Design a binder for these strands. Structure first.
Length: 58
RNA sequence: UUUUUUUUUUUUUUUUUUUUUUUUUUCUCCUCUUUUUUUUUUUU
């Protein structure tokens, strides 16, 4: 019963689609976007992703 | 004492041409474990 619910609450997209750069120019300048390097743990490497300014990406 | 006649190896040579490696399939796919990540230092 789960199966149909998880498979029909997934539709036909897997990842957020990207977008242009001038957006990122502005989003920086206006002050709503930080940007740094990104590393990963290695015991847990599918979950524990960090964004060195640390932002936990789950 | 046994004369005379019954052809034979197809004729021909003095014709133009402006293309080009290959060639045509097989789907989506659960990466297991002390961690933040250590870090100066000196002898190459």
């Amino acid at each position: 019963r789960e199966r149909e619910n998880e498979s029909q609450e997934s539709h036909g997209k897997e990842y957020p689609e990207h977008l242009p750069l001038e957006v990122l120019e502005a989003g920086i300048k206006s002050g709503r976007y930080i940007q740094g390097i990104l590393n990963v743990n290695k015991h847990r490497a599918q979950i524990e992703a960090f964004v060195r300014l640390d932002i936990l990406i789950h």
